[PDB]
Design a protein around this ligand. Structure first.
Ligand SMILES: CC(C)N1C[C@@H](O)c2ccccc2S1(=O)=O
Length: 284
């Protein structure tokens, strides 16, 4: 069923809450035993958001390999994503260790450091060129190279140095700065413009490790970003673009991380973004 007609049918019937609960009911349940070990309590932002054991990213160290981060591998689309929480004061070094080890080219940030008057993640990148950051626990140096501030988003060029080997890489930081404190954006136009800037950078391409994507918990806004990207890529690849089922794609992605898409409004917004984005994919 053409999703645009499915959309109008759910809207006219006001059944978004019903569709969303059906997804919650059918979603995978896999163990998260490593996340719940007492040694890892200060590595988790939220007690109820944990990576599954089967898909969790492992840090390359014998001491403690744990980070709250999941590998989402989309086999038919040929895209992979790492979805992670906003870094905590004691996990900023782990965060950049993961970027280095997984060979990512991009970091996508969908939250502000402060929202609703509370801290949603650590200030984990440098704000001035001449004040670099050193992460003593993981032996990394991070320098701000340049910053491009736009109306809806900011792009930063960062230099990450492995102080152990003196190798350096360029990391691109894509910061969507206008998601409202409550609800979802009224139009998906600025979110789609942002998604197309990440794509144009090379950050999502198979020559690089997987993009790192985060919000505060790494399931809600973060889920919306990867769901919209994968659905549009499948509509490009297939003979029949109308065969793309957004609900089935979301349940596939929920095999790899719990709770992706946090509200019925986020589900409706994901449909809107894919429907409006397809009017480019199909030749406009
Ligand atoms: C081997 C080539 C294709 N690269 C892939 C990846 O390892 C990476 C990650 C961050 C910055 C640069 C690079 S890369 O251009 O050296």
């Amino acid at each position: 069923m053409e999703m645009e007609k499915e959309f109008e049918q759910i809207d006219k019937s006001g059944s978004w809450a019903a569709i969303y609960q059906d997804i919650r009911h059918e979603a995978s349940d896999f163990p998260s035993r490593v996340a719940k070990l007492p040694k890892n309590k200060n590595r988790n932002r939220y007690r109820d958001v944990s990576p599954f054991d089967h898909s969790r990213i492992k840090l390359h160290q014998e001491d403690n390999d744990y980070i709250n981060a999941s590998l989402i591998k989309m086999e038919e689309a040929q895209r992979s994503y790492i979805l992670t929480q906003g870094p905590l004061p004691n996990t900023v070094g782990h965060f950049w260790e993961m970027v280095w080890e997984q060979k990512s080219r991009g970091v996508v940030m969908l939250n502000r450091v402060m929202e609703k008057g509370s801290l949603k993640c650590a200030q984990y990148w440098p704000q001035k060129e001449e004040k670099e950051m050193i992460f003593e626990d993981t032996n990394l140096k991070l320098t701000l190279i340049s910053e491009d501030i736009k109306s809806y988003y900011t792009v930063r060029q960062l230099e990450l140095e492995n102080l152990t080997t003196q190798e350096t890489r360029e990391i691109l930081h894509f910061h969507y700065t206008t998601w409202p404190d409550f609800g979802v954006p009224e139009s998906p136009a600025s979110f789609l413009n942002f998604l197309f800037k990440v794509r144009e950078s090379g950050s999502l391409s198979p020559e690089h490790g997987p993009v790192v994507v985060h919000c505060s918990a790494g399931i809600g806004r973060s889920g919306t970003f990867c769901l919209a990207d994968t659905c549009l890529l499948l509509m490009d690849k297939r003979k029949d673009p109308s065969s793309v089922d957004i609900k089935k794609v979301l349940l596939e992605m929920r095999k790899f991380r719990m709770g992706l898409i946090q509200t019925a409004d986020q589900l409706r917004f994901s449909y809107l973004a894919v429907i409006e984005g397809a009017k480019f994919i199909m030749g406009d």
